[PDB]
Structure formats: C-alpha cells, structure tokens
Symmetry: C4
Subunit: 74 residues, 4 copies
C-alpha cells in the first residue's frame, strides 16, 4: 500500500500525545526540585538544633559531677 | 514510491519511546507521593525541636539551683 | 523534492537518539525512588 | 507523490519533544545532586541520635542520685 499523508499525520498525533505525558513529567520534576530545596532548608534547621543537643549532653555531664559533689560533701 | 511498510521502523521507535516515557511517568508520580510522606515526617521532626529549647531553659535553672545547693 | 526513504530514516535515528536521553531519565528516577525510600 | 515538506510537521513535533525531554534531563540531574545533599545531612542528624541516649542514661543516674540527696 502506498504511503499516504494520513500515515505521516498519524505519527504526528502520536508524538503530540506523547508530548502531553512528557509535559506532566516535566511539571512534576520541576515541582519536586522546588520541594527538595525546601526540604533541605528544613533539614538544615534540624541539623542546627542537633548540636544544641551536644551542649545539653555537656550540661548534663556537668550536673552529674555536681550531684556527686553534693553527695561527697555529705 | 514509498510504501506503508517503509514507515514501520519509525512507528516502532515511537511506540518504544512511548512505553519508556510511560514508565518514567509511573515512577515520577510515585516520587511525588513519596515526597508528600517525607515532607510530613520532616515537619513532625521540626516541631519537636520546641522540646529541645524547653530542655535548654530548664537546664539553665537546674544549673543555677545547683550552685545554690553547692553554696550550702 | 520527493520524500525519500532517507528522510524517514533520519527521523528514526533522531527518535532513537532521543530514546537514550529518555533511558537516562528513567534510570535516574528509578534510582531516586529507591533512595527516597531509604531516606 | 509525497514531498519532503509533507514531513515537516513530524520533524517539528520530534524537535519539540526532544527540547522538553532535554529539560526533564536537566531537572532530574539536579534532583540527583540535591538527593546527595539530603542524604548526607540526614545521615548527620541520625548520627547525633547517639547523644540522645547518652543524655538518657545520665539522666537515669541523676534521678537515682537525687533520690539519695532527698533522703539525706
């Protein structure tokens, strides 16, 4: 059967239909990019506090040495 | 004169591209759902950071109060 | 100019070249899926 | 007889698909890099969780030691 314009047109519509799926992917990965950026900022906030924990650890160690001092003094 | 079968390789190549794009779509929709879960859980972690500074303030009082006892 | 087989073949190679980019995307999003699960 | 120009719409549609796929590629490579950063920072957070249980154990001792003082 001779190739016809309609055969080429069928491929055009197929590609344009595929393009709509590509468009959803692109919109979604851009949204994920923005959201991962925001997530990292929040992870940064958590990290900054996690070392406030290290100070807490030190203060508690100091409190223990003190409490032993109270008991040692009787 | 070109025949319908002369287009077969192009038709097949587009079918394969479409199958693989569809699998990307399936995966990125799953990444979107996973990101919802991660965001909710990180927000939960971030909220508990209020306890840390409360612990912080109380420990300041425990420090001063203990100096008082030590003075005795 | 009459359409020739070489004109169709040019589009085939273009699509197959595009398919390699699609393949990298697919490999990478699957890897991201596994890594977000672990995260 | 089909002419070269009869393929123009298909050529353009594939060019546009390729441009948009290229932008997906650019974005997903960036997501990969971002994920490296997130993974490293979450691993850092997870490591500090050792301090929490150390605080936990010490506080147990502070509890018992204080019961001692209260008796005294």
């Amino acid at each position: 059967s001779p190739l016809q314009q309609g055969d080429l047109n069928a491929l055009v519509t197929s590609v344009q239909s595929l393009a709509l799926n590509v468009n959803e992917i692109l919109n979604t990965v851009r949204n994920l990019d923005s959201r991962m950026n925001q997530l990292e900022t929040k992870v940064d906030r958590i990290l900054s506090s996690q070392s406030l924990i290290q100070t807490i650890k030190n203060d508690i160690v100091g409190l223990k040495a003190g409490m032993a001092t109270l008991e040692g003094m009787i």
